[PDB]
Structure 1
Amino acid sequence: KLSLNRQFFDERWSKHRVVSCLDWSSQYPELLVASYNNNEDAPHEPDGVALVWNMKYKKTTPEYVFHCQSAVMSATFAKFHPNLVVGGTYSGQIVLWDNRSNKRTPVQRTPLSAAAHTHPVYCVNVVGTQNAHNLISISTDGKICSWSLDMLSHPQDSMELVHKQSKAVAVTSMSFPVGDVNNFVVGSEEGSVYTACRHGSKAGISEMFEGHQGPITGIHCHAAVGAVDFSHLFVTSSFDWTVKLWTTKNNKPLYSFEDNADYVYDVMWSPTHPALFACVDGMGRLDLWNLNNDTEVPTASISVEGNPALNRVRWTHSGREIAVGDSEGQIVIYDVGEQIAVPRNDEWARFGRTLAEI
């Protein structure tokens, strides 16, 4: 059962803005950072905004606020630096914000040089360990750059994602498998999903995956960890009105879900339940597919009031609260029934059996 647990919105910052990206802090699960692009009506307002909301307290206003001159197309928590928040912008300038520092201006910003990001950066992540980690950022011209939080002036590493001779890849979404630091998956505007390798003899695009006839909107790998290793599965949502499940070893999609009547702008796996994922479409509809119960209808469905063009969805690390951001800056958070969110002890074996059924 889907019940609206909370309703986050600000009349000054988030009004007349779409939610470009969401993220949860791993260390502090109560926190939620979300990004908002430029306000259309008021150019005097700062373009990119990043708001931190809380689940512990009932404070309607954001827990923290940040902004920068360029529309923040992506935002994320530094998984090993709780005081820091990173954000990729439309200008390509990555920005950093420190909650300890009281400045709303970014404390560290990358350059806009040729070696650095110049095209819009829709894809930012932190990958590594506490002992050492890297900020990986991919732009829409196929340029990937690895930076360090302690020094954003110079790119620690950089290259271009190039496949099929003289042809770049317009990466729209990214994802890393659980337990994988070198391999990742990206989604081009041409619908071809590319599995790529960070460092190696064949560093760059490694494998092509075809089947999507529209631009990709969101990719996520199997974040649920259990006895049976399903880390090789990943889901992609695109403009085909479809959600496609793929194996990294298999060059064609494992399965396709076509129930959506409009574009699907975001999809992500349940972090605890293995066979459950959630997607959000353009009709303001949020659909949870549980592959251990059904495969042609969503296991759960809900419609957002006003039917806004839902943009982004994220799960909590506990796996219960689902925060989704729409095209009116109206973040809505739902709670799922325990029969859906929590998996039975045989859900992994049942998931393996259902995969074998395909």
Structure 2
Amino acid sequence: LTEEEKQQILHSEEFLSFFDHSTRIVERALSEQINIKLSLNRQFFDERWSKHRVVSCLDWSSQYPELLVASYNNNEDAPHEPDGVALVWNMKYKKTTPEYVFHCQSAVMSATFAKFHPNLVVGGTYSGQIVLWDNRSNKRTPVQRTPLSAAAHTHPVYCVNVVGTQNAHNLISISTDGKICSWSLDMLSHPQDSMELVHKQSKAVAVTSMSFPVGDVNNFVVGSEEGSVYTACRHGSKAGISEMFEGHQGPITGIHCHAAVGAVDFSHLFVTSSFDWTVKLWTTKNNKPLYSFEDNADYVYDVMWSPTHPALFACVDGMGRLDLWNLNNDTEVPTASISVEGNPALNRVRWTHSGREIAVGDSEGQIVIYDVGEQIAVPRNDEWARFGRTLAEI
């Protein structure tokens, strides 16, 4: 009868594949195969990793349209416990448990998957340090960390993305001071490219978030908490600010470019959800806002285009209402709407790839995903044509 060999083999941690496969199979074992318009589809609220916790970012895995990464800042509930909480939540089978967890010593502001590799996860934290995590390996510590240096990002980082294809990729990141930096997925210890973005008279732009024209690298569009949108070419013939926008009055929190591609070219349309209920539409060729969004006041967080419908997008109000806007059928009234129970401060919204359902963050950590009506999920050539003519309206 062993008394120590089992004890020491338990102490020795060779359980990487063990734990990985056990997790991937037991949530499957939740299956009960015993032989004896908007609509909620799945509500997930991790009690252990989301108790009184604000969702910090949301991304859907392009390589794996079933994997979502969500972030968290420091927890005021307890400072001693790990502050930067990163969660990976899966679409494989119903379960309360999160599929993966991750810790960052600093508060995590944003996170996303990498397009270059289908398993690495990259996230920007409050300390301005890009943090790398490997999903296949079962670890809690950051795999890599960019240096906290003068050249590198130092102010809190809110936007990180991967541009290019799987052989011409490049990791772009912003610092709220205004530094743009390009790294590579292979090494996260030296900025391949880096410069402090400036608009004029050497004054920087307090960038909050950016997006990029769909299917295009370089020539990004950024938003400023100062209340101005800027189009800046990454390298071009001259890096830095290329165009300044009349923009919106208050701080510009969420910015996104049109993503649905069809018989017409609509990649020049920006949505910007400022802090004044004002989810503004416009185009890079026109310095003025194209259409002003007004149904209430006081902080709509953000907006993202549905990748499947060219004239439909999702924006959420911090009061607790997520509402789906079609542009073809209606210009002003919400074509779809819902309010998450508890009327909580819903933070971040992310359209899943290929659309057909939405992911919603919250200040309470209770993230909710749910689909959309078929009659409004699917586009048609009529939709693109009538969208073009609604653009011709004004």
Contact 2:116–2:185 under 8 Å retained in 1: no
Partner of 2:4: none
Corresponding residue SS for 2:244: strand
CA distance in 1 between counterparts of 2:219 and 2:386 reads: 28
* Cα distance, 1:345 vs structure 2: 2.8
SS of the residue corresponding to residue 351 of structure 1 reads helix
Percent identity of equivalent pairs: 100
8 Å CA contact 1:72, 1:87 repeated in 2: yes
Q: What SS does structure 1 have at the residue aligned with 2:304?
A: strand
State the distance in 2 between where 1:223 and 1:49 align: 30
Partner-residue secondary structure (3-state), 1:257:
coil
Are the aligned partners of 1:261 and 1:283 in contact in 2 as well (CA < 8 Å)? no
State which of 68, 80, 102 in structure 1 corresponds to 2:104. Answer: 68
- In structure 2, distance between residues paired with 1:313 and 1:143: 25
Distance in structure 2 (CA, Å) of the matches to 1:260 and 1:69: 39
Instruction: Tell whether the 8 Å contact from 2:129 to 2:146 is kept in structure 1 after alignment.
Output: yes
DSSP-derived class of the 2:392 partner: helix
1:27 shift after superposition = 1.4
Q: Report the CA distance between 1:154 and its aligned residue.
A: 0.7
Moved over 2 A (4+): none
How many Å apart are 1:41 and its aligned residue? 1.4
CA distance in 2, matches of 1:303, 1:109: 39
Helix, strand or coil at the partner of 2:199: coil
Cα shift at 1:201: 2.7
Deviation at 1:197, TM superposition (A): 0.6
Q: C-alpha distance in 2, partners of 1:286/1:337?
A: 15
CA deviation after TM superposition for structure 1 residue 191, in Å: 0.9
2:38–2:370 Cα contact (<8 Å) kept: yes
* Structure 1 residue 11: Cα displacement: 1.2
Q: Alpha-carbon deviation of 1:224?
A: 0.2
1:63-112 Cα distance to aligned partner (Å, 9 max, x none): 11111111110000001211100000000010000012222101010011
Greater alpha carbon shift after TM alignment, 200-209 vs 135-144: 200-209
Per the TM alignment, residue 245 of structure 1 is displaced from its structure 2 partner at its CA by 0.4
Note the C-alpha offset of 1:284: 0.4
Q: Deviations over 1:4-60 (max 9, x none)?
A: 100111111111210011000011111111111111011112111111111121121
Q: Do the aligned partners of 1:142 and 1:161 also contact (CA within 8 Å) in 2?
A: yes
Give the equivalent residue in structure 2 for 1:85.
121
Count, aligned residues: 358
Contact 2:326 2:334 in 1 (8 A): yes
CA contact (8 A) 1:280 1:313 kept: yes
Q: Is the 8 Å Cα contact of residues 115 and 165 (structure 2) preserved in structure 1? A: no
Report whether the alignment pairs 1:187 with 2:223: yes
Deviation at 1:295, TM superposition (A): 1.0
In structure 2, the residue matched to 1:37 is 73
Shift of 1:317: 1.0
> What's the secondary structure of 2:203's corresponding residue?
coil
User: Contact 1:210 / 1:252 at 8 angstroms: preserved in 2?
Assistant: yes
- In the TM superposition, 1:197-346 aligns within 5 A as 197-346=233-382
Secondary structure in structure 2 of the residue aligned to 1:155: coil
Counterparts of 2:378 and 2:69, CA distance in 1: 25
The 1-side partners of 2:46 and 2:386 are apart by: 43
Return 5+ residue gaps in structure 1 as ranges: none
1: distance between equivalents of 2:272 and 2:296?
14
The question of whether the paired residues in 1 share the 8 Å contact of 2:322 and 2:337 is answered with: yes
Q: Is the 8 A contact 1:66 1:104 kept in 2?
A: yes
Question: Residues 193-240 of structure 1: CA distance to partner in whole angstroms, max 9, x if unpaired?
Answer: 011110023211110112311111111101001010000111000112
Unaligned runs of 5+ in 2: 1-36
CA deviation after TM superposition for structure 1 residue 308, in Å: 1.1
Superimposed CA distance per residue, residues 149-208 of structure 1 (whole angstroms, 9 cap, x where no aligned partner):
111111101001101213111111110111210111001011100111100232111101
- 1:297 is displaced (CA, Å) by 1.3
TM-score (norm 2): 0.89
Partner of 2:139: 103
Question: For the Cα contact (< 8 Å) 1:260–1:281, is it kept in 2?
Answer: no
Distance 2:262 2:108 in 1: 35
Question: Per residue, is there more helix in 1 or in 2?
Answer: 2
C-alpha distance after superposition, 1:292-351 (max 9, x if no partner): 011111111111111111111011112111001011111011211111111133100010
Q: Who wins on radius of gyration, i.e. which is larger?
A: 2
Contact 1:2 1:334 in 2 (8 A): yes
The alpha-carbon deviation at position 276 of structure 1 amounts to: 0.3
Q: Secondary structure at the match of 1:34?
A: strand
Q: CA deviation at 1:242?
A: 0.5
